[PDB]
Design a protein around this nucleic acid. Structure first.
Ligand SMILES: CN[C@@H]1[C@H](O[C@H]2[C@H](O[C@H]3[C@H](O)[C@@H](O)[C@H](NC(=N)N)[C@@H](O)[C@@H]3NC(=N)N)O[C@@H](C)[C@]2(O)C=O)O[C@@H](CO)[C@H](O)[C@H]1O
Ligand SMILES: [K+]
Ligand SMILES: [Mg+2]
Ligand SMILES: [Mg+2]
Ligand SMILES: [Mg+2]
Ligand SMILES: [Mg+2]
Ligand SMILES: [Mg+2]
Ligand SMILES: [Mg+2]
Ligand SMILES: [Mg+2]
Ligand SMILES: [Mg+2]
Ligand SMILES: [Mg+2]
Ligand SMILES: [Mg+2]
Ligand SMILES: [Mg+2]
Ligand SMILES: [Mg+2]
Ligand SMILES: [Mg+2]
Ligand SMILES: [Mg+2]
Ligand SMILES: [Mg+2]
Ligand SMILES: [Mg+2]
Lengths: 117, 208, 86, 137, 74, 60
RNA sequence: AAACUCCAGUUGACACAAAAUAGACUACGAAAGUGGCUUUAACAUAUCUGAACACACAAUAGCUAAGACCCAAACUGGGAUUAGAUACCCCACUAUGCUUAGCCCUAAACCUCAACAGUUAAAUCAACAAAACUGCUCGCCAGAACACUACGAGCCACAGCUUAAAACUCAAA
């Protein structure tokens, strides 16, 4: 249930002091905002911390820390593919909510009319 | 470019075409039919269908060449392979009965392994966070670390510390030092590994 | 202080999955409002500034609720064109 | 039976045991995630100090103490002094929204300690004292 | 659009003209340029649907009054 | 323990000072009995329609 | 960086300070203003209007006097930045904020939209903002600046408040 707007704005019929002081008129627009960019999550950090911890003990030798390096390597390969798959698939793939570009073509077919005609 | 986008790169592999039709998968079969229609670029001079062709030794020759003098870079490359070969034969006749089984005399196996012992695993890439550039450790791609291995070997030999030593004798000495995990080129990888482990606090700035 | 310990804001760990407990705990504190309250209590927010923020947050809710109510009302009309060609 | 996220009340008898110990007996790991530091102190159920570690005690200075790597290092250092005294299972009571709030919890797991619960005891007043004035930076 | 096909057929059947498509600005108030100087505009416009697809009056309702064309409308 | 009783208005302030000196009384509060406050009957929740005519019908 | 190092953390005892959530509520009161709990007293008026000064009120800051003191904090001191930095950033501390008793009487005290009654038709309305009007009454205003000034008067106000001009000047504001 959307909050009420009776006796909220400063008007002539409203005797009481205003409850809301909006800088922009409370009128729905005919478009939505564009989705922001996500910061992202660094990958292969746990594999990358145990591989740099083995070098210190083994004085940065790649012959005794081979197992750790594979974990850090194999992970990087998996993360690389995921980044490629996610970028294309999300836009092309239709799951859940629509995209702003596709939702603004639907809001322009049923525009909000704050005027009389 | 004088080639259009339609033109496709050629496939020099000689055992690919010979493949029996019975092995061809449905997807592969389609591809083979598709190529017929496509236009094919002319094969460049560098790569043939020979059995001695090594793509890693051809790229290393191109990274040494100066001013398009490919006859000299290739000459240096072959002299180096012969120098690595003759030094190991000299270490094999003078070796003990049980030491001759662990002495590699094939210069190619030494070249490929020497370059693989110099490939770094992680590097430093500047990422912009809070209006500042931070050299955060990033997992280098396979190609990048393969390129650095070659660049470091060629820079070390070019470096004017060897007063009067010819490239074949210098490169052969460095290739044998990296084969046994020794020398400056290996040290240069450790120095990059010691700087990526000191700046591990900034390993979350990156997103991918 | 005077209340019993290990009851409030306490979440138990299932099968050594601490990450899920911390994500669950952090979701309980955000839904209740403690997270933002702790962030606004680091520096004193003057009454006039706090009254200016409460209005902005209430006007954004109103707008976002109605904007969402129209998106769910018009999503039925996101189907294929039935009069393709006219 | 099922699994509840609510802590087992002491009075009512339950069957949840860890190494034969009740929830009340388990030692407590008090984490204070500040903005520029992260102090960790492990105590028993009878309020007996077992281990103390912090970013400052691990050789970090100034702005290196307010990181997630320093908090994890202090957790490993507090999980090594308490593991010599017979500590395996702990009850975490985190206090503060600092950077080393979750990183210190990971360091305790990288020291051989098993976390059975996560308690939040961040000081929230029901208006009490007035904070410092907002800053222009 | 649902009845666009039906209306166009009837017009042809009764020897009359139809415009069930997007109304380009100037069909009536600028016909001389669009069609020619000796063009003859309609003497009667029959509106089966007076509103457009965004639930607003059709532009021809106002443009037919400027050109003193009598309109019939549902 | 609950003690329902009738008293004059002046006895509350005198009795609140007696409960503060008794050593066996942890906490004691005197409140107006909730049974002397009739509850007005409710017909149900009245729906509220969105506010209208808040802005002029002009083409901004 | 300075500062502190009888410092920090856990536990326990412990306020003349300030009052999370609820509050997506929209209430009380003349306004100012009021959002922890309880109790007592208690919220003018059966026509409207009606005052810079009468009468009674009026945020914050501030004065006088006596108390309290967690935190905050003008001034001041220290540290740093900077060409400089009487600033912005850091630390510390005071007046002050609290209580009691008096004073002061200001505000972008602005929902910049007087009180009462009424209408939604007609010419809808310069623009913007918060649609346009009617009746009645009180108050106020007539180019800009000089001017929240000067003088006079009054006031527990003595670097103060209220009321409030003119001359020179411009052809715009
Ligand atoms: C339409 N006239 C505009 C007006 O010009 C005015 C302008 O008048 C200026 C007065 O001389 C000067 O003493 C006066 N100076 C003062 N210290 N009072 C100026 O303020 C004044 N300008 C003004 N009011 N905008 O200069 C005068 C010579 C002018 O041309 C008279 O007509 O103002 C000028 C800008 O100052 C504009 O450029 C003109 O277009
Ligand atoms: K205002
Ligand atoms: Mg505005
Ligand atoms: Mg409260
Ligand atoms: Mg009156
Ligand atoms: Mg008068
Ligand atoms: Mg006045
Ligand atoms: Mg006052
Ligand atoms: Mg005072
Ligand atoms: Mg202080
Ligand atoms: Mg200074
Ligand atoms: Mg003081
Ligand atoms: Mg006000
Ligand atoms: Mg009046
Ligand atoms: Mg004037
Ligand atoms: Mg003034
Ligand atoms: Mg004066
Ligand atoms: Mg005077």
């Amino acid at each position: 249930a959307t909050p009420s707007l009776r006796g909220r704005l400063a008007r002539f019929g409203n005797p009481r002091k205003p409850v809301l002081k909006p800088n922009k008129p409370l009128i729905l627009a005919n478009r939505v905002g564009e989705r922001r960019r996500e910061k992202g999550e660094a990958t292969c950090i746990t594999e990358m911390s145990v591989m740099m911890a083995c070098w210190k003990q083994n004085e940065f030798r790649d012959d005794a820390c081979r197992k750790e390096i594979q974990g850090f390597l194999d992970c990087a390969a998996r993360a690389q593919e995921a980044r490629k798959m996610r970028s294309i698939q999300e836009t092309l793939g239709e799951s859940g909510s629509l995209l702003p570009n596709k939702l603004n073509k639907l809001l322009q077919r049923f525009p909000n009319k704050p005027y009389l005609s | 470019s004088r080639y259009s986008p339609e033109f496709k790169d050629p496939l020099i592999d000689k055992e690919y075409y010979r493949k029996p039709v019975e092995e061809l998968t449905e997807e592969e079969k389609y591809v083979r039919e598709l190529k017929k229609t496509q236009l094919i670029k002319a094969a460049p001079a560098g790569k043939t269908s020979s059995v001695f062709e090594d793509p890693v030794i051809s790229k290393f020759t191109n990274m040494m060449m100066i001013g398009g003098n490919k006859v000299l870079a290739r000459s240096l490359m072959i002299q180096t392979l012969e120098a690595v070969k003759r030094k190991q034969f000299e270490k094999y006749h003078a070796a003990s009965a049980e030491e001759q089984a662990t002495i590699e005399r094939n210069p190619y196996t030494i070249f490929h392994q020497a370059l693989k012992n110099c490939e770094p695993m992680i590097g430093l890439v500047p990422i912009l966070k809070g209006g500042r550039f931070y050299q955060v450790p990033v997992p280098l791609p396979d190609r990048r670390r393969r390129f650095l291995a070659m660049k470091w070997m060629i820079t070390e030999c070019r470096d004017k510390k060897h007063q009067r030593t010819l490239m074949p004798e210098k490169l052969s000495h460095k290739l044998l030092e990296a084969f046994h995990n020794q020398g400056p080129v290996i040290k240069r990888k450790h120095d990059l590994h010691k700087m990526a482990e000191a700046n591990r606090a900034l390993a979350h700035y990156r997103w991918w | 202080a005077k209340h019993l310990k290990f009851i409030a804001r306490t979440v138990m760990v299932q099968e050594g999955n601490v990450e899920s407990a911390y994500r669950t705990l952090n979701r309980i504190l955000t839904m209740d409002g403690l997270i933002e309250d702790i962030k606004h209590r680091r520096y004193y927010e003057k009454p006039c500034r706090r009254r200016q923020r409460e209005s902005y947050e209430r006007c954004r809710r109103i707008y976002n609720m109605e904007m969402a109510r129209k998106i769910n009302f018009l999503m039925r009309k996101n189907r294929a064109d039935p009069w393709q060609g006219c | 039976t099922k699994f509840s996220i609510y802590p087992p009340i002491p009075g009512e008898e339950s069957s949840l045991r860890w190494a034969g110990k009740k929830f009340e007996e388990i030692p407590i790991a008090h984490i204070k995630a500040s903005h520029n530091n992260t102090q960790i102190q492990v105590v028993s159920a009878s309020n007996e100090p077992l281990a103390f570690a912090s970013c400052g005690t691990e050789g970090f200075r100034n702005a290196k103490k307010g990181t997630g790597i320093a908090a994890q290092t202090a957790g490993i250092a507090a999980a090594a002094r308490a593991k010599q005294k017979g500590v395996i299972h702990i009850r975490v009571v985190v206090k503060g929204l600092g950077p080393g709030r979750l990183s210190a919890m990971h360091g305790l797991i990288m020291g051989g300690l098993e976390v059975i619960s996560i308690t939040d005891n961040t000081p929230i007043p029901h208006n009490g004292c007035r904070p410092r004035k907002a800053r222009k930076l | 659009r649902q009845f666009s096909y039906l209306i166009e057929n009837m017009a042809r059947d009764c020897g009359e003209y139809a415009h069930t498509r997007y109304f380009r600005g100037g069909m009536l108030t600028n016909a001389r340029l669009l069609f020619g100087p000796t063009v003859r505009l309609p003497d009667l416009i029959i509106f089966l649907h007076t509103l457009n697809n965004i639930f607003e009056p059709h532009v021809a309702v106002r443009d037919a009054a400027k050109m003193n064309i009598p309109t019939v409308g549902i | 323990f609950l003690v329902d009783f009738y008293a004059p208005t002046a006895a509350v302030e005198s009795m609140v000072e007696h409960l503060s000196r008794d050593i066996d009384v942890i906490r004691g509060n005197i409140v107006k009995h909730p049974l002397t406050q009739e509850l007005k009957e409710c017909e149900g929740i009245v729906p509220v329609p969105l506010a209208e005519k808040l802005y002029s019908t002009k083409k901004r």
